[PDB]
Amino acid sequence: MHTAEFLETEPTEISSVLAGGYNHPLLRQWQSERQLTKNMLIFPLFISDNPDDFTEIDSLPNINRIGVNRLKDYLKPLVAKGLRSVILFGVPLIPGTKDPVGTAADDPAGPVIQGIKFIREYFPELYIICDVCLCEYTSHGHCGVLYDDGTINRERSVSRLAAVAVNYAKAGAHCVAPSDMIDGRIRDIKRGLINANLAHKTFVLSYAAKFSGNLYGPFRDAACSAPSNGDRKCYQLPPAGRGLARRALERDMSEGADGIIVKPSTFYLDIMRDASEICKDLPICAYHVSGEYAMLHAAAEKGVVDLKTIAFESHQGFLRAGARLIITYLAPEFLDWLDEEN
Amino acid sequence: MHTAEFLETEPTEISSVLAGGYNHPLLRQWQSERQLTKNMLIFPLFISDNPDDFTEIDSLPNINRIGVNRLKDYLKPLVAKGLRSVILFGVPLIPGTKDPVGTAADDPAGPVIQGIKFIREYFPELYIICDVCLCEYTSHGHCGVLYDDGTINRERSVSRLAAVAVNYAKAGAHCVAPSDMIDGRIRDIKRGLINANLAHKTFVLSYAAKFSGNLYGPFRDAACSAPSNGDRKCYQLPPAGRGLARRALERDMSEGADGIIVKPSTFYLDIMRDASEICKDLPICAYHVSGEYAMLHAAAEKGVVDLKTIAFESHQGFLRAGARLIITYLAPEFLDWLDEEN
Amino acid sequence: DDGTINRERSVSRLAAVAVNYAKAGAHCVAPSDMIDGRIRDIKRGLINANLAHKTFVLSYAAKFSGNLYGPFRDAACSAPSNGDRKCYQLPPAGRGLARRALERDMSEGADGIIVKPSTFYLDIMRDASEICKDLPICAYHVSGEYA
Amino acid sequence: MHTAEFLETEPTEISSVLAGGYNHPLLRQWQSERQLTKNMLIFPLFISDNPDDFTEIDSLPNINRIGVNRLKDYLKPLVAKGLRSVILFGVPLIPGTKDPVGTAADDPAGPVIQGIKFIREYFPELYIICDVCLCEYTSHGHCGVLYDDGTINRERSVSRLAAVAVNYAKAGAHCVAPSDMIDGRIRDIKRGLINANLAHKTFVLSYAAKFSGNLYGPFRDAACSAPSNGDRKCYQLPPAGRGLARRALERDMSEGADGIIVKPSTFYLDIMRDASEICKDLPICAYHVSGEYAMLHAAAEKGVVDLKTIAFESHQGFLRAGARLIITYLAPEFLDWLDEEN
Ligand SMILES: *C(CCC(=O)O)CC(C)=O
Ligand SMILES: *C(CCC(=O)O)CC(C)=O
Ligand SMILES: *C(CCC(=O)O)CC(C)=O
Ligand SMILES: *C(CCC(=O)O)CC(C)=O
Ligand SMILES: [Zn+2]
Ligand SMILES: [Zn+2]
Ligand SMILES: [Zn+2]
């Protein structure tokens, strides 16, 4: 008869026993480097020039184009549940608005600056963050000033970027986050802020490690800046580019960045890890891109994973990889989930 | 008129310019720490006791229950395309087979050992890896010998595990990978192998960092060992448990592991990063669990990302995080994709 | 009878009490004695009692002798005097010993370490944060600091 | 009967035995990284414009407002007991003295510069240190030149600070310690000193890590610069700001600081620890702020701790955390305590 065999073993080595540290539910919390709090979430917003807008993108519940006139009733509840911050994305829909130099970027009458004045008044405790780029304002759609050759003209673009950034700060935005990727833009924005005597009031949250890939789908649909699928990648770091990513982090920090953002998040967890050592003194933020979040919804839909569970696992993943800040479309949800206790 | 402003900037610092290294397609390859080769893929197999089986699980194309009699025609093409290895998972379906001590685990007539003899003969170049656990053979389903109290009895289970492992090695398997998680099992298996005078022929590929979570869904459906949803987590590391994960890696390596596996993969990229430093001298393998792969398919289905693209991005992610080996259900595909060139 | 502490006897005694608490239902045991090697003996006892996988060993790895345990002594009734008979209590300037005690306890099975006092020993939690970088670190705001 | 149980134990491991190193009183001294000497203490002084002043603040024995005419009889004994240094704090009480630009800061006839000339003559061996700030001279009270907006104007303030610092040096002060916190002030003061051809004679003791908090109470009462309670915190580092503190240390050292000060002390011991690695080549000084010392007195009063004991424990704490210098109001006492021996 085939019988159950058992090998001859020695006494248990203490050094093999780790189970004493994670056998209780509360211990599973004790074991985490950092716990998830509501004041760690940054909710993204897509302001439309149509002050009466409210368009849902790709069926994703936390991705809408809202006009200033709907902003109150939408932000009201959120702030009530504990939302402490948001990152503004302008979507100028009015015809003949976009152009070669993204002039509308700092248009005092655009969705961004108008959104700032609104928030700064209807919600003075909220911390306003503004994404800085020319992609949603240039006729071509790229994140900068290109030559007739097509390529990006560093100097011109960067000089343009510093202008928009400083203008947002002047408008009342507490923080600026350039997602362009053009070399040296962080230094030029820091300088501009310095000369504008705003460097001591504006947090520079640089998109230090933004990789090109197959996960920005939804976002492109909503921000309208349509790069195709994945060919025209400006300063977007190749996915395998760990070396460049590490160098970009040391660069941006050296150029004035007060905090860095890694994105995508989930698919780049080892990168936040590297950042956690390089930028060990700076707040690290993870960006759960529109594609990752749209991916969680899909799988959940097909019942491949529970939505609420995979969100916690994924988000805690950010915290574990080294991040202490999180920009995510799941913010509305977490503002609820984080409460369920007591 | 709102005009496009441009700030006063200084001459470009060389140290800001990184674009010179990733502006060409071939350079994007030059920038990667390691390139993806076909001999890096480990295709998982689920052997059934019904020698004539061939059941597709959850609609996932690369997750099937195959009997020995279908194994040839299935492995034929794969090996032709370059498959160099597979990790065996036994699924005994015959009634009254499973029991309290997972006796059938090393059953010379079971799917695993029978699968080994088959492969070792019909495909002598293939490298055989066998997952070592009691979960798919115990009446209860857990990965070990539990007390009447329910809990796992370390000593008994581990002594049992070393037995099965050594028996697989004796059967002809080149490598054993214990996915249990019970403390000290690696040392007991190494010893058993040593005493069985097989330690110099069997690669011990330990599941050093296996986290409990919401991503093993599909696999449970196919391996039939049904832990519920996510409550009875044996030695499964809490997702936030980076400290424990780091300690488990140092432990397993110290206990004889010749290589380590991190799993899940994508959601634990920072962990392969940590492993890449801790186990800097050992091959690191990433396991693209059934749930992550089922997640890529879902999102692709809803057209959230291109399947072939997100697979390359995700898999290259493993290589970038430090891994040099990959166990994935996408192996059939990659064996094709990796070819398209010349 | 000499007054001094008998390591072997005491430690053997300590492992007994610890394991008994675990057997009673306590999830975690924290030995605040300071006697060398007690962590290993308690870990073993727990192992033999087949409780090592359910009991978190929260060792008082860095407990310094000093002028801050006043209140606590009044309440726990165990009255060492003022500050003379300090058993395995680390001298306040003893950073080296504190660092060694941390590596020892962790190596002996501790699942987490406690530093105490807290405030007056913040640089020590700092050292611990590197030494025991993989273990939960706990600070003890002693009765004297709070008072 | 409940009997005393004793577990079965193995032979003692040498590696568990540390007691051989601290079982004797002299060994407790042998174990310290550095011993406490009298020439390590810096006694603070608050000079008043009333040359005949002598006011005790908040009942704290070593916190008095003294005029030049009382300075001798007060410093006489102290220097006799071994005092080798003091840090000057000016308290101009004369009406209409303070203003918007802290003009009186380097007033050749003010308490500070007058105090320097006095000391330099009546006690030539004493090492004079001068705190550099505008807080005790500006009409508003803040440590710098503010805009009508209220905020601090970096450029103006810093340019002002370098002026005062260099003037103190010109007056005869051996060392300058800017406690402002304004970014870049260290570099501007170093430069000024360089241009004043005094950089090779003046030790720049920067307040690199000065945290805002609830411990400067007493001091505010005596220096008269009354920021409220704890709201208007200029460049004061948030208590949780370890990252910023680490960056500020690397900055000040890079800007010319010859030594750094950490403050508060006790409540920031881990910070001196960080400093001990960052500024491993520079003397590190701890500042036992007025609030910590007032706290020791209180607890001692209520008989919670012995004054003389907790002072030694706390102060040795500074030395252990990495400090080799100590600014404390307990200096008179220690100059006595350090003697009791032989
Ligand atoms: C990044 C986030 C895109 C997404 O959510 O899909 C926007 C940016 C780089 O500014
Ligand atoms: C791990 C892989 C599970 C999956 O593919 O979903 C199996 C194991 C831990 O043995
Ligand atoms: C430590 C705490 C004493 C106090 O709170 O004052 C007690 C112990 C060492 O067990
Ligand atoms: C710091 C010391 C304050 C105190 O003793 O309470 C004075 C300064 C920052 O110049
Ligand atoms: Zn852009
Ligand atoms: Zn198992
Ligand atoms: Zn000041």
PDB file of C-alpha atoms and ligand atoms in Angstrom, chain B residues 44 46 63 87 89 131-133 135-136 143 177-181 207 210 215-220 236 263 287-292 327 329, ligand 2:
ATOM      1  CA  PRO B  44       2.889  25.492 -15.505  1.00  0.00           C
ATOM      2  CA  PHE B  46      -1.934  20.714 -14.048  1.00  0.00           C
ATOM      3  CA  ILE B  63      -4.856  26.792 -17.755  1.00  0.00           C
ATOM      4  CA  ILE B  87       6.369  23.315 -13.170  1.00  0.00           C
ATOM      5  CA  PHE B  89       0.934  20.664 -10.317  1.00  0.00           C
ATOM      6  CA  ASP B 131       5.565  22.171  -6.802  1.00  0.00           C
ATOM      7  CA  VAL B 132       5.802  20.640  -3.324  1.00  0.00           C
ATOM      8  CA  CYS B 133       2.722  20.901  -1.134  1.00  0.00           C
ATOM      9  CA  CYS B 135      -2.835  21.325  -0.270  1.00  0.00           C
ATOM     10  CA  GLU B 136      -4.004  19.424  -3.354  1.00  0.00           C
ATOM     11  CA  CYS B 143      -1.056  23.016   2.514  1.00  0.00           C
ATOM     12  CA  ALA B 177       9.553  24.111  -5.272  1.00  0.00           C
ATOM     13  CA  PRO B 178       7.770  24.036  -1.890  1.00  0.00           C
ATOM     14  CA  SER B 179       4.897  26.548  -1.922  1.00  0.00           C
ATOM     15  CA  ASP B 180       3.635  25.687   1.567  1.00  0.00           C
ATOM     16  CA  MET B 181       5.156  28.518   3.596  1.00  0.00           C
ATOM     17  CA  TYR B 207       8.546  29.928  -2.734  1.00  0.00           C
ATOM     18  CA  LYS B 210       4.324  33.989  -1.298  1.00  0.00           C
ATOM     19  CA  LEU B 215      -5.200  36.905  -6.901  1.00  0.00           C
ATOM     20  CA  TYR B 216      -5.221  33.102  -6.765  1.00  0.00           C
ATOM     21  CA  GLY B 217      -8.811  32.693  -7.928  1.00  0.00           C
ATOM     22  CA  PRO B 218      -8.464  30.835 -11.223  1.00  0.00           C
ATOM     23  CA  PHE B 219      -5.735  28.499  -9.933  1.00  0.00           C
ATOM     24  CA  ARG B 220      -7.923  27.335  -7.058  1.00  0.00           C
ATOM     25  CA  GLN B 236       0.891  33.270   3.706  1.00  0.00           C
ATOM     26  CA  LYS B 263       4.607  35.733  -5.855  1.00  0.00           C
ATOM     27  CA  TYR B 287       5.325  33.990 -10.655  1.00  0.00           C
ATOM     28  CA  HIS B 288       2.649  35.654 -12.789  1.00  0.00           C
ATOM     29  CA  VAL B 289      -0.193  34.097 -10.797  1.00  0.00           C
ATOM     30  CA  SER B 290      -3.424  32.905 -12.365  1.00  0.00           C
ATOM     31  CA  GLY B 291      -5.196  36.008 -11.097  1.00  0.00           C
ATOM     32  CA  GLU B 292      -2.815  38.553 -12.628  1.00  0.00           C
ATOM     33  CA  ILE B 327       6.676  31.180 -14.370  1.00  0.00           C
ATOM     34  CA  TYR B 329       0.612  31.044 -18.262  1.00  0.00           C
TER      35      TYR B 329
HETATM   36  C1  LIG E   2       0.794  29.496  -6.817  1.00  0.00           C
HETATM   37  C2  LIG E   2       0.221  30.057  -8.112  1.00  0.00           C
HETATM   38  C3  LIG E   2      -1.276  30.267  -7.991  1.00  0.00           C
HETATM   39  C4  LIG E   2      -1.875  30.874  -9.243  1.00  0.00           C
HETATM   40  O1  LIG E   2      -1.328  30.664 -10.344  1.00  0.00           O
HETATM   41  O2  LIG E   2      -2.911  31.564  -9.123  1.00  0.00           O
HETATM   42  C5  LIG E   2       0.537  28.032  -6.521  1.00  0.00           C
HETATM   43  C6  LIG E   2       1.315  27.555  -5.301  1.00  0.00           C
HETATM   44  C7  LIG E   2       1.502  28.554  -4.162  1.00  0.00           C
HETATM   45  O3  LIG E   2       1.798  26.413  -5.187  1.00  0.00           O
END
